[PDB]
Amino acid sequence: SAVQQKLAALEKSSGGRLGVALIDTADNTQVLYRGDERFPMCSTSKVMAAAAVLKQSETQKQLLNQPVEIKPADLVNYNPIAEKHVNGTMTLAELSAAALQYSDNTAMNKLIAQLGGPGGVTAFARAIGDETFRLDRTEPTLNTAIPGDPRDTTTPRAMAQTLRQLTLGHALGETQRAQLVTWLKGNTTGAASIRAGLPTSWTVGDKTGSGDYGTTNDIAVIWPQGRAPLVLVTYFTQPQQNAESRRDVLASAARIIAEGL
């Protein structure tokens, strides 16, 4: 296909390895590039942890209001929001918003702890039918992105199907799904990634991720006007441990996808 040829050309120009999955909810058609290869998720995994806590809140109806203590020992490498509340508390809702909209790593670790460890996040993926996702570590070591290492990876196809189920499907209850959508639409870290390759008119909710080996990721739900929504996953990683991030590759992949509508 023409889109597959342009994505291959983009990958060749970039020097790395690119993975893309698009789901068009209009006809349930899919476009895949390296769709079944594993990529390190980095912070895109935060969506699964937040969704797992939302699922718990279907039965524990005030869970999201539960205060959680932030102590100095809890702070890791990147904690833009949690730092503002050290020696105080944040609710699970506030921690979920911080993990999703600012990529706060302390917030992610608190969500992992609430779920009983990485195995609790992976279990939620299995419960909604994702047999590919695996979360093995906490922050910040889940971002090592070592070539060939299966820890903390998924495939573009699997993450696109899961993100569709969580945001447009019924894997979560109605209030929970609406909350997740609201959080994703309010992300602050995504301006230079998928969003930058799409019409300024389209509404996007996304979660970025970055890590070692120049790993640069973004997963998005896209609402074009007068048209069914799309789900787009773009993963990118590079051969040198110290490579720079390449958000422009993700923007270019989105632009190529959008050309073909």
Residue numbers in the entry: 27 to 57, 59 to 238, 240 to 289
Sentences from the paper on this structure:
Serial crystallography at conventional synchrotron light sources (SSX) offers the possibility to routinely collect data at room temperature using micrometre-sized crystals of biological macromolecules. We show here the versatility of this setup and methodology by performing structural studies at room temperature (RT) of three additional enzyme systems of biological relevance: (i) Klebsiella pneumoniae CTX-M-14 β-lactamase, a β-lactamase relevant to multi-antibiotic resistance mechanisms; (ii) Nectria haematococca xylanase GH11, a highly active xylanase suitable for industrial applications; and (iii) Aspergillus flavus urate oxidase (UOX) in the presence of the long-lived intermediate-like 5-per­oxy-9-methyl-isourate (5PMUA).
CTX-M-14 belongs to the extended spectrum β-lactamases (ESBLs) that play an important role in emerging multi-antibiotic resistance mechanisms. This class of enzymes hydrolyze the β-lactam ring structure of most prominent antibacterial agents used in medicine and render them ineffective. Three more independent runs with microcrystals of CTX-M-14 were collected, yielding 61 331 indexable detector frames from a total of 127 171 recorded frames (dataset ‘all’). This corresponds to a 48.2% average ‘indexing fraction’ with 28.7 ng of protein consumed per indexable detector frame and a total volume of 91.4 µl microcrystalline suspension used. Data collection and refinement statistics are, as expected, superior for the combination of all runs, and the nominal resolution (based on a CC1/2 cut-off of 0.15) extends to 1.4 Å (in comparison with 1.55 Å for the ‘mini’ data collection). CTX-M-14 crystals used here have the same symmetry and unit-cell parameters as the microcrystals in complex with avibactam used at EuXFEL. The datasets collected here allowed us to determine the first non-cryogenic structure of inhibitor-free CTX-M-14. Like in the EuXFEL structure, two N-terminal residues that could be built in the cryogenic structure (E25 and T26) could not be built in all three RT-SSX structures due to the absence of interpretable electron density. On the other hand, an additional residue (L289) could be built into electron density in two of the three datasets (‘all’ and 10k) from this study, which is a residue that was absent in both the EuXFEL and the cryogenic structure. The B factors and Wilson B factors of all RT structures are very similar and, as expected, higher than those of the structure refined against data collected under cryogenic conditions.
